[PDB]
């Protein structure tokens, strides 16, 4: 399966995916990395790994649909089968999500359905949970509501901040995102006809 990874920043999840997809038994290959922000560290990681990169600045498009179409164009150029959102911080449009239905994955740093949105760690700390975690899910139109593929729980320590908690949760992200990608790319897991998760 041919994979596009979309990023907006550091790219530690991208790096974990690059490392996993180069194992001999990987069913996935990363053929393109797309960023919506220029000069981010994830681009360096991709170029260092010999993967093509494209920057699509959302600020240069009139609306969300035009932006997504620019993304889609590149996806078609590279004959992509699967899309991974890896620190990609934009909300995708309905038709774009519909086209890639069952083919697009997102990592989210909470145990969904808790703490949806862009500041999951702040929410978790504010709420005072002692267990948080991360979630890989299929991307549906409603944000952070698509079908869950894998999750891993991560403890919150007394005195945690966003810095220390996100560091601990990233260690789990780097385990389940590659595992989830391998499940979908091998055809082991798919979005079922009834929309629910199917383990073949
Ligand atoms: N249709 C859709 N379903 C999803 O399940 C999903 C996950 C993402 C991946 C990210 C989900 C995000 C949640 C909140 C964000 C935010 O508040 N701010 C962005 C600005 C860009 C934007 O919201 O369009 C920021 O960091 O500046 S970004 N994008 C998705 N789009
Ligand atoms: N709404 C999605 C979201 O919050 N994504 C989160 O952004 C970070 C990106 O780090 P990275 O650039 O090192 O992968 C990760 O913690 C990821 O779960």
CATH number of the structural domain spanning residue 169? 3.40.50.170
Question: What 3-state DSSP class applies to 73?
Answer: helix
Handedness of CA 9, 34, 189, 196 (dihedral sign): positive
Identify the CA nearest to 104 among candidates 193, 14, 196, 180.
180
**Domain that includes residue 184, residue range:** 1-200
Q: Is 23 annotated among the ligand-binding residues?
A: no
Mutate which of 10, 89, 136 to test ligand 1's pocket (most atoms within 8 Å of Cβ)?
89
Judge contact between 2 and 31, C-beta under 8 A: yes
Tell me which ligand sits closest to the C-alpha of residue 97.
1
Helical (H) or strand (E) element with 108: strand 104-108
Domain count, the chain: 1
| Annotated resolution, angstroms | 2.0
- CA–centroid distance, 182 to ligand 2, in Å, is 19
Nearest protein CA to atom 8 of ligand 2, as residue: 87
Provide φ and ψ at 90, rounded to 5°. Answer: -125, 145
Q: Is 93 annotated as a binding residue?
A: no
Tell me which H or E stretch contains 32: strand 29-35
* Ligand 1 within 6 A of CB of 139: yes
Q: Are 86 and 5 in contact (CB under 8 A)?
A: yes
Please give the method by which this entry was determined: X-ray
């Amino acid at each position: 399966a041919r994979v596009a990874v979309l990023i907006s920043g550091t790219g530690s999840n991208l790096q974990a995916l690059i490392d996993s997809t180069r194992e001999p038994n990987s069913s996935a290959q990363i053929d393109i990395v797309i960023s919506n922000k220029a000069a981010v560290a994830g681009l360096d990681k991709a170029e260092r790994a010999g993967i093509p990169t494209r920057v699509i600045n959302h600020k240069l498009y009139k609306n969300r649909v035009e932006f997504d179409s620019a993304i889609d164009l590149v996806l078609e150029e590279f004959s992509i089968d699967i899309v991974c959102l890896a620190g990609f911080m934009r909300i995708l449009s309905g038709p774009f999500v519909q086209k890639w239905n069952g083919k697009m994955l997102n990592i989210h740093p909470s145990l969904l359905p808790s703490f949806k949105g862009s500041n999951a760690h702040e929410q978790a700390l504010e709420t005072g949970v002692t267990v948080t975690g991360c979630t890989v899910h299929f991307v549906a139109e409603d944000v952070d509501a698509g079908q869950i593929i894998l999750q891993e729980a991560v403890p919150v320590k007394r005195g945690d901040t966003v810095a220390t908690l996100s560091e601990r949760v990233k260690l789990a992200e780097h385990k389940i995102f590659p595992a989830a990608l391998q499940l979908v790319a091998s055809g082991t897991v798919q979005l079922g006809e009834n929309g629910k998760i199917c383990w073949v």
